[PDB]
């Protein structure tokens, strides 16, 4: 659910969403990390879990449409620098 920029789950959020004790949050992440459901790390001092990867899941058409919209911005950025390098290095381009 959370974006890749804000994938630092605190121990309270995992405890509240999973109806588990805060002390049991840590063991829960081990099972997810060991099995392979999620990739990431645990920061026990700060009580935060740094997830970096999740198992891909089945997505609805609307979610796919949002995914395609993300490619629209990605394609624009790649095209923008393709013209930028072409324009700037036109004389030395082979």
């Amino acid at each position: 659910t959370r974006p890749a920029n804000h994938r630092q789950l605190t121990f309270e959020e995992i405890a509240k969403s999973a109806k588990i004790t805060v002390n049991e949050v840590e063991l829960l992440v081990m099972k997810a990390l060991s099995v392979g459901l999620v990739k990431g790390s645990i920061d026990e001092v700060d009580k935060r879990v740094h997830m970096t990867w999740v198992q891909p899941r089945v997505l609805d058409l609307q979610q796919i449409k949002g995914m395609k919209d993300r490619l629209e911005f990605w394609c624009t950025d790649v095209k923008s620098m393709e013209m930028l390098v072409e324009h700037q290095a036109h004389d030395i381009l082979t």
Partner: protein
């Protein structure tokens, strides 16, 4: 009806590569094959395609043409859109120039009896380098006509005397028992663009960043190399001041030139770091999370 000196033999891009590949693989056997094509006119001989005859056994020389291999290869090539007659034969001369030996002259006479305009193409895969292939097309000079005082061919143009005969070929019977036909190459846009894909790096390699650990170590090592070269470069400047112009170059033989190596290290390092920096900067926005 004397043949014209302005006659040209046109070898396709596919034909040239086949003889080069077959000739090199058969080094030093004089591996032979048949050239398929069409006698367009009295002045043009097109070689659309060639195929290689098998070597019957050991021996660095041209063997007899195998008729069963030739006939049933020609029959089976006609099925896949190649109804082209045999316009001559090709064979390899691995490194000793392009000419015809005594055995080659006899082999050509077999083709001359069937087709009077048969062409003997000799390819040197060993002496051929990038951008210049050592090739030549030969046709025999009849002894009866030349002995009585007749030129083998008429010269109505300048085209056939643009290439100066090699001394190796002139030694081995050129312009005495056989003559050379100028070879032109037929290249189209389609095949030429297709060959441009050779060594064309993948798009992944262009954006791929070199390992930063090895890049820094290479940065480290080469800069350390200039530390010694610069120290030697200073000595080279003072030495050449008090040193005679006859030894401007003789004294440079057998001793490394710090200036030359410094330029190479600078040139190597400038492209290594600029490409790595630009690739890193391009990947920063192209691959962005936002």
């Amino acid at each position: 009806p004397a043949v014209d000196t302005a006659e040209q033999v046109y070898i396709s891009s596919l034909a040239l590569l086949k003889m080069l590949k077959h000739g090199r693989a058969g080094v030093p056997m004089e591996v032979m094959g048949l050239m398929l094509g069409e006698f367009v006119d009295d002045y043009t001989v097109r070689v659309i395609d060639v195929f290689a005859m098998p070597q019957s056994g050991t021996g660095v020389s041209v063997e007899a043409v195998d008729p069963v291999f030739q006939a049933k290869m020609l029959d089976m090539l006609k099925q896949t859109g190649r109804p082209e007659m045999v316009v001559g034969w090709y064979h390899s001369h691995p490194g000793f120039g392009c000419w015809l030996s005594g055995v080659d002259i006899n082999t050509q006479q077999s083709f001359e009896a069937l087709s009077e305009r048969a062409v003997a193409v000799v390819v040197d895969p060993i002496q051929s380098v990038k951008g210049k292939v050592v090739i030549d097309a030969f046709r025999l000079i009849n002894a009866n006509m030349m002995v009585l005082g007749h030129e083998p061919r008429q010269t109505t143009s300048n085209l056939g005397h643009l290439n100066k005969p090699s001394i190796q070929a002139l030694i081995h019977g050129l312009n005495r028992h056989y003559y050379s036909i100028t070879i032109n190459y037929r290249k189209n846009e389609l095949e030429q663009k297709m060959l441009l894909n050779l060594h064309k790096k993948s798009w992944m390699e262009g954006l791929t960043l070199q390992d930063y650990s090895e890049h820094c170590k290479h940065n480290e090592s080469v800069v350390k190399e200039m530390l010694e070269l610069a120290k030697n470069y200073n000595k080279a400047v003072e030495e050449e001041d008090k040193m005679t112009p006859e030894q401007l170059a003789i004294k440079n033989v057998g001793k490394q030139d710090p200036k030359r190596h410094l330029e190479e290290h600078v040139d190597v390092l400038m492209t290594s770091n600029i490409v790595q920096c630009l690739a890193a900067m391009l990947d920063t926005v192209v691959f962005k999370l936002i």
